[PDB]
């Protein structure tokens, strides 16, 4: 029912990172999961 | 070969919304009937045309019964003569133009149906012709039968001055001066050529009015729509 945190497009220019406060958190720490649905947008986790 | 163009008389039907003087038409008719309709035809006016303008149905039926007209053939194959009805037109003086010419010495008297419309100056012109018949100036003289009128082109016309004081007795008892007789007949000749005169001007009022309403109303709708573009602001923000 509830939409995902991020809507996913194909061919759209990605969002840029210019500081160490916005870059932190991204480093992967646990193995990848992959999810697809009927309602909720497709995502990939740490 | 100079020219004297007519002056513009203040007619009761001069103005944009001014109708014809219909009592003045009823007089003008009689001036055709008594004076003109033994020389000039008027082939596009019927006795039924007068009804609801200057005569009633019962009046027009009498004016029509008063004149002869050919009809037929009957079962024998013979062309008879009968009294007129409303459906009949105003009768031609002669059986053709060639006859007409003989009767006036060479000159053909024009049909009067459209004579207002067919001449520069219209009723102004015709009035100036009828009243303006004067004695020639020194050095001048035309062929025995061609009179001097300063308003006619080439200053010489082949028509005898047709009106003078008390040339007929009007049905409403107006003093029949030359000028009054010319004023009334011109008023009829106008209606003759342009029957639509009074309907046309009634429409004219209703068009000016409706337009007066619709033009600013549509202009407001236009400005309302365009308002989005007239008001907009542009900005140029290069990197």
């Amino acid at each position: 029912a509830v939409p995902a945190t991020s809507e996913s497009p194909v061919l759209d220019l990605k969002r840029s990172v210019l500081c160490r406060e916005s870059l932190r958190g991204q480093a992967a720490g646990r193995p990848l999961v992959a999810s697809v649905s009927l309602n909720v947008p497709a995502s990939v986790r740490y | 070969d100079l020219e004297l163009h007519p002056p513009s008389y203040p007619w009761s039907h001069r103005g944009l919304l001014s109708s014809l003087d219909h009592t003045s038409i009823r007089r003008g008719f009689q001036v055709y009937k008594q004076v003109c309709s033994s020389c000039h035809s008027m082939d596009y006016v019927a006795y039924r045309h007068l009804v609801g303008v200057c005569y009633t149905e019962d009046e027009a039926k009498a004016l029509a019964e008063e004149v002869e007209v050919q009809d037929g053939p009957n079962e024998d194959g013979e062309m008879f003569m009968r009294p007129g009805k409303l459906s009949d037109y105003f009768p031609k003086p002669y059986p053709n133009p060639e006859a007409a010419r003989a009767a006036n010495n060479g000159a053909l008297p024009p049909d009067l149906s459209y004579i207002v419309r067919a001449r520069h100056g219209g009723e102004d012109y015709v009035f100036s012709l009828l009243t303006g018949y004067c004695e020639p100036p020194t050095g001048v003289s035309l062929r025995e039968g061609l009179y001097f009128n300063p308003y006619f082109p080439g200053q010489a016309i082949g028509m005898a001055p047709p009106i003078y004081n008390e040339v007929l007795e009007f049905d409403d008892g107006t003093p029949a001066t030359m000028s009054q007789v010319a004023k009334d007949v011109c008023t009829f000749l106008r209606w003759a050529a342009e029957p639509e005169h009074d309907h046309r001007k009634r429409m004219g009022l209703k068009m000016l009015l409706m337009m007066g309403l619709l033009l600013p109303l549509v202009y407001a709708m236009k400005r309302h729509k365009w308002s989005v573009l007239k008001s907009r602001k542009l900005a140029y923000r290069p990197p």
Binding site: - | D1, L2, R223, L234, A235, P238
Partner: protein
């Protein structure tokens, strides 16, 4: 050609107002009259001069025709 194919444009913002939020005749006489005078002054002595000449060649030619059809004292 369709809208979306006309030409290339970059970094140009446009702000605008609903017609139901705004007036159809903002300052219509206030700002209108002067804008008209400005526009009229701008074009006048490009447009007007030829039509002056026409008027002068017309009135000159008209009452030359009249005079020429009068009689000469000789």
């Amino acid at each position: 050609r369709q809208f979306g194919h006309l030409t290339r444009v970059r970094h140009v913002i446009t702000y605008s107002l609903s017609p139901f939020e705004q007036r159809a005749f903002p300052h219509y006489f206030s700002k209108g009259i002067p804008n008209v005078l400005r526009r009229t002054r701008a074009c006048i002595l490009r447009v007007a001069p030829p039509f002056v000449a026409f008027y002068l060649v017309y009135t000159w030619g008209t009452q030359e025709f009249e005079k020429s059809k009068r009689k000469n004292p000789a």
